[PDB]
Amino acid sequence: RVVHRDGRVIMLSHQEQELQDFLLSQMSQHQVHAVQQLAWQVLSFS
Amino acid sequence: VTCVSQMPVAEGKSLQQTVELLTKKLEMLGAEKQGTFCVDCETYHGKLMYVMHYPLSCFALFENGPCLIADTNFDVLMVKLKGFFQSAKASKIETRGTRYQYCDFLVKVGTVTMGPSARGISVEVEYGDCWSLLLEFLQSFLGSHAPGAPTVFGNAVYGPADTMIQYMELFNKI
């Protein structure tokens, strides 16, 4: 079982965890958001 | 915790048919067969026996649930006082029925014993009070009912297995 932020528990199998890549993409987006907050900060339409 | 039962307010057809319609509504809500239980009653002139969930029986005229043993421990006492305290009048009606679980809860409807008896329902909770929220469930089940009247102002707290005394109130409805 796994929870990123919102209790998103899902079941899976031995060697099927490609959701990790989706988490990487979301983290990239969140990092764009954070660096935009660093340096003119656009809205939160991500 | 142990919410008190309620009288079968719904009475517009056959008691069996009424229980069937109630179970159909419960299934329409969505549940599973969690077994079938019963509620016994034996009065002795007034110790009222009882049994529920389930390896334990209970009997008390007016006490705060003095039962912590099986029926054998109590039945032996009754058999020993066959002339001392054995005042077994006409056998008190005893209900039974299946039990289902919508979600994280439990439901149980009763049946008639001699035929002109009630078919009330019983529900409980999982918290330790909080009588307001649990009512909402019954609002989805039926109309206005379930006055409750628990042993309030005690939390002698949380009413552990004391709801059987409330069950005696259901036995009063005769």
Binding site: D6, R8, I10, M11, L12, S13, L19, F22 | M28, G30
Partner: protein, 138 residues
Amino acid sequence: TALPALIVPILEPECLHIFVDLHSGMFQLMLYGLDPATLEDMEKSLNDDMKRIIPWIQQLKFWLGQQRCKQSIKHLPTITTETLQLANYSTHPIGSLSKNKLFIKLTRLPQYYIVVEMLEVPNKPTQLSYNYYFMSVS
């Protein structure tokens, strides 16, 4: 088949493994997933008749298709069910045993989403083509 026992697929890609009791009859089986205490009926039926297999085949097909659907949609905010629980106007929807998903992020329950694969594919035990239909009831 294999060395210990046989193997049977259910889809056209892993699941639905079945083996034999080396000490008695009633060969057991276990599909990685859900629905326990229900496969036991299938076990009993195979132990008794051994002929009726294809109804359980179709049932497992439906079950695993819906399971894959849910397991792939459970990444976005949603919720599953088994029926709309309200057949008010039985004119708009039509079909067979189906599934349904909903959502919260847009609104509480403005429009559900009932979906069903086109079962009984022509000359294909798999690939039900996963028909889709949208509804806008409230």
